[PDB]
């Protein structure tokens, strides 16, 4: 019962409640989703301030 | 303040009374004595006098017992760094020989070894150190402080030492001679350290003492055979 | 003064301390091999700092955790006698230096920080680069209460301080200001340091610092800001060797005749370290318009420059009768102005490093170089005098040559040797001093025996392995100073002691003081042999002492030192002394069964 | 008088002992009864009114009573009143105070290797404090406690997570880059470093915010000093320390596992990389020979724990990803 | 627009500093003249 | 001095005050912490001395406030703001 | 480009204010001197 810290023990907390909703149902892909650019835009406003 | 001075005087009297029949005194007081030990500013005042009196009383109340002397075996490092003054009486008080042979570490050996360097002159501290030597079992323990460093206090003043000796003869110096004698007493024969020590000091003395004896003093005649 | 928020005191800034109250003046370190701090009681105050007190300068630092290094040091300093090997000790050695090196990084990561009351201070000295602390012992030798002033290199043992004001003006955690009469106190000693009321056996203006319960409220005083340092510029604490390009120097010596001389040593080439020290060292200082001796000149300095061996400035009679040797210079006629020379000026305001020209004070007089000598010298082969006249030109420029601080801290080290060894050597051969000074003169020499080699010792007397590392600039520093002469003088004084032979009365009787110092003496004299011939020019003096060697002491290798390197032209004077007939005759006078030495002379 | 009264509570929470309309005792039920009282204010004000050295060193022992297995309401119990009213800096500093004292003692402790050696009283207090903090922080995933590593008492009086790290940095000698890591490993002190190890790891697990700065950004150098246990083995190859070195390594890679827990981060991994060498996979392969040096044992790592010699490599192989 | 304004504006601003410096230089020069003074 | 003059349109009743680490070229901000004193037009240093008046015939402790143009850093004293609720009581 | 121009320009502009303040300060000082005047 001292399992295997939270990102494991999340799904043990799930499994009693049946609710299926933790598999990568449609959305995940683990592909790129390139986020460096948003940070660049944030840096760019900096210039305005 | 006045009340505090009176307690110290009373304690000294009580210590003498306790001392005249030691087992009984220690047992009865092992409570009061423990409190006194626990109790054990820097100025010439009512606290200074009390400290001196307390040290003397302890020297006497500590002096009667050995297991009770072992009962104050902790907290004794509070005077070993102090190097000078009142701590010496307690150090002298601590000795009965069998007990001394049975229990001392090397952490106070440099505690007077560096106390050979700093911490005042230590006139009685040589006797305070020779009593710590107290017995070649402590002679094996005495070679380490003899191995570590040279501090002595102008002891080995060869030709210069002879000139110094002449000054001493003209008019402290006797204490230095006694300290040298104590070191020699500690010397003793074979040990690795002991043999070597006996050798360097012995040669120096033989040339010099053979010479000092020829150009002689009366108290120096007492220690020179030692 | 266009300050908005500055002038407080900051980490990474140099400063100076000042005593107040029962004793007044600065804090210095008389002596450079020594360890005694000193408080001059009379010569210094807030408005008139005296001459030699460049040495009072103190630099400020961050803290520097003493611990790992302390453990290594403690292991190294013996008594345990065992429990040590390369697996423990040498694996701790490179486990010490890089975490010692990060202290040097953090030094360079705090260029300026407002210093609040209560934090660490970690004071440090300029010229010595050897900062002070105390110990938690009681080796206080004049007033017997619990302190010690040790100038140390590693030093991070109770060198942390905590600072508070004397008065309840500010609080704990407020910005200090220049002129704060602060208290100063080690974080583990407890007793704040104090200006004593004692003297000792030195110059009569001597005192020292003790550390007691009562207080000496010290006002710091500032003459230097931060973020302007070595940094290919000049400040009011630098030194310089102003070399020309006609002949690339000018000379400064004290003549017994009242005028003094700028002869040119028959050549000047490349503007190198190949130069007499005493002729060359001038310091550069600014005026700052302030009574306090200032620094950080940044154009329009109206500077003046001061000599190092003696204390004098410039002066000039403009047309009449330059290197005029004036001690005190608060006048106009000692303060100059300097030329742009292609650093164009409207508002240039930056003190560059390359080249300058000169103009005096208030008349704005052109300092040049002429073709005449003085002709008191009675036919020196080449000599030129330096004259000035208000004719403007573009010709007589000469360069601000920055001297490295490592070379000036070796110069005074050699100077402080002669100021100590050159005095004590005449008296212990005459009489008797404390025997602990014989111990003290030992590590005086033992610090010197690997000073000249340039490398910190690992063993005790292993001077043959570092022998393969020469550097001419240190031996020239030791040649031009009189250290060599003094040491040979010292040898003769013990020879006279034996007289008032050498093996019998001095070596065979005592065996402790005299054999050891000759071994300290011979390997130093052996160390100067292997680099250049001008050291070997001195062998035309040190031939009579090897003529009179007889203790079988260590000095016989100096004969090999005089002879191991084949000298043909040195021996043209060396064997050209012709006393080999005395020397091998002394070898023949060595009529004991020890013949090998005689064979060696013949072999040479 | 108050000490035995407090000491009475510790026996009252004491359970599973002495057994050989009556209410059936539940360990969870026992905790619940204590929680029903909620008399955690006795601890919630006891440290806040902390004066007795026996008391503060005793009340944390009472803290394991509300802790030690349950703490469902109990973790919610300390959460609200802990952000309750105006004693936070007076309380967190009070715990902080013990940490500072302990650090000084640790700094001034043993020196070097060339009726037993008793640990300092301050050091002993430290084990209890560490355990108390760990228990509070841990609940299987403690959201609010994790948020609570910081606090809004203005002053804020500590960052006890990073305040854990220096005390965790202290016990290993903190500057020993390496081989004196074995010179710092205390055979009687490792049991302190053991609980001192896992309490950091429990500080990490789950959300990557609150541990994420305190992984290797905290400026107390010793992130690699954390990973130095992965870097090599202990010099005193003791017997009970033979399992202990396994227990050390078993505690070791647990902290490394919480080192990189939520990926898609560069510099945080670089902290694991900036002190480490690329050849440590062969060091992990050395564990493969160490696990190859494993004798005839059937060890399976499921259900309650066990240190597998290959399992530590199995732990260490997780650092591959 | 920003580049041209920056440029012109910048130039003018930089150019002005120059007057001020000459006057300032003179003040210190007067102090030296005062010492030169017999 | 504490000279008790009723009407003060002269010069000898109007003072000037010290920077004391609020550095001034153009500081122009009247802070709250600490000041030192200087009188009008002579710019005289107001300090604290060690003498009493000794009209009081042995009060146990008393000191007079004297001024003299010797500059120092010692005799600062604080602008202590009083709450308006206490002056209206 | 804007950042560097802003920086240099800004610095120069801020620096100038300073001359003006000294002169202004003096005027009021002259008024005090006038009252000091006997």
From Swiss-Prot, chain D:
Family: Belongs to the InsP3 receptor family.
Protein role: Inositol 1,4,5-trisphosphate-gated calcium channel that, upon inositol 1,4,5-trisphosphate binding, mediates calcium release from the endoplasmic reticulum (ER). Undergoes conformational changes upon ligand binding, suggesting structural flexibility that allows the channel to switch from a closed state, capable of interacting with its ligands such as 1,4,5-trisphosphate and calcium, to an open state, capable of transferring calcium ions across the ER membrane. Cytoplasmic calcium released from the ER triggers apoptosis by the activation of CAMK2 complex.
Post-translational note: Polyubiquitinated. Polyubiquitination targets ITPR1 for proteasomal degradation. Approximately 40% of the ITPR1-associated ubiquitin is monoubiquitin, and polyubiquitins are both 'Lys-48'- and 'Lys-63'-linked. Phosphorylation by cAMP kinase (PKA) enhances calcium release. Phosphorylation by PKA increases the interaction with inositol 1,4,5-trisphosphate and decreases the interaction with AHCYL1.
Subcellular compartments: Endoplasmic reticulum membrane; Cytoplasmic vesicle, Secretory vesicle membrane; Cytoplasm, Perinuclear region
Binding site for Ca(2+) 2: 138, 202
Lineage of source species: Eukaryota, Metazoa, Chordata, Craniata, Vertebrata
Quaternary structure note: Homotetramer. Homodimer. Interacts with ERP44 in a pH-, redox state- and calcium-dependent manner which results in the inhibition the calcium channel activity. The strength of this interaction inversely correlates with calcium concentration. Part of cGMP kinase signaling complex at least composed of ACTA2/alpha-actin, CNN1/calponin H1, PLN/phospholamban, PRKG1 and ITPR1. Interacts with IRAG1. Interacts with CABP1 (via N-terminus). Interacts with TESPA1.
Covalent cross-link (Glycyl lysine isopeptide (Lys-Gly) (interchain with G-Cter in ubiquitin)), residues: 279
Protein name: Inositol 1,4,5-trisphosphate-gated calcium channel ITPR1
Tree of life domain: Eukaryota
Domain notes: The ITPR1 structure has a large solenoid CY assembly built around the central helical bundle made of the C-terminal domains from four ITPR1 subunits. The solenoid scaffold includes domains responsible for binding of ligands and regulatory proteins and is connected via an allosteric nexus at the cytosolic-membrane interface to the transmembrane channel assembly. Six transmembrane helices from each subunit form the central ion-conduction pore.
Swiss-Prot record, chains E, G:
Localization, UniProt: Endoplasmic reticulum membrane; Cytoplasmic vesicle, Secretory vesicle membrane; Cytoplasm, Perinuclear region
Post-translational modification: Polyubiquitinated. Polyubiquitination targets ITPR1 for proteasomal degradation. Approximately 40% of the ITPR1-associated ubiquitin is monoubiquitin, and polyubiquitins are both 'Lys-48'- and 'Lys-63'-linked.
Domain of life: Eukaryota
Annotated stretches, region: Disordered: 22-38
Family of this protein: Belongs to the InsP3 receptor family.
Task performed by this protein: Inositol 1,4,5-trisphosphate-gated calcium channel that, upon inositol 1,4,5-trisphosphate binding, mediates calcium release from the endoplasmic reticulum (ER). Undergoes conformational changes upon ligand binding, suggesting structural flexibility that allows the channel to switch from a closed state, capable of interacting with its ligands such as 1,4,5-trisphosphate and calcium, to an open state, capable of transferring calcium ions across the ER membrane. Cytoplasmic calcium released from the ER triggers apoptosis by the activation of CAMK2 complex.
Summary of subunit composition and partner proteins: Homotetramer. Homodimer. Interacts with ERP44 in a pH-, redox state- and calcium-dependent manner which results in the inhibition the calcium channel activity. The strength of this interaction inversely correlates with calcium concentration. Part of cGMP kinase signaling complex at least composed of ACTA2/alpha-actin, CNN1/calponin H1, PLN/phospholamban, PRKG1 and ITPR1. Interacts with IRAG1. Interacts with CABP1 (via N-terminus). Interacts with TESPA1.
Free-text domain note: The ITPR1 structure has a large solenoid CY assembly built around the central helical bundle made of the C-terminal domains from four ITPR1 subunits. The solenoid scaffold includes domains responsible for binding of ligands and regulatory proteins and is connected via an allosteric nexus at the cytosolic-membrane interface to the transmembrane channel assembly. Six transmembrane helices from each subunit form the central ion-conduction pore.
Protein name per Swiss-Prot or TrEMBL: Inositol 1,4,5-trisphosphate-gated calcium channel ITPR1
UniProt organism field: Rattus norvegicus (Rat)
Encoding gene, per UniProt annotation: Itpr1
Range of the intact protein held here: 2702 to 2739 of 2750
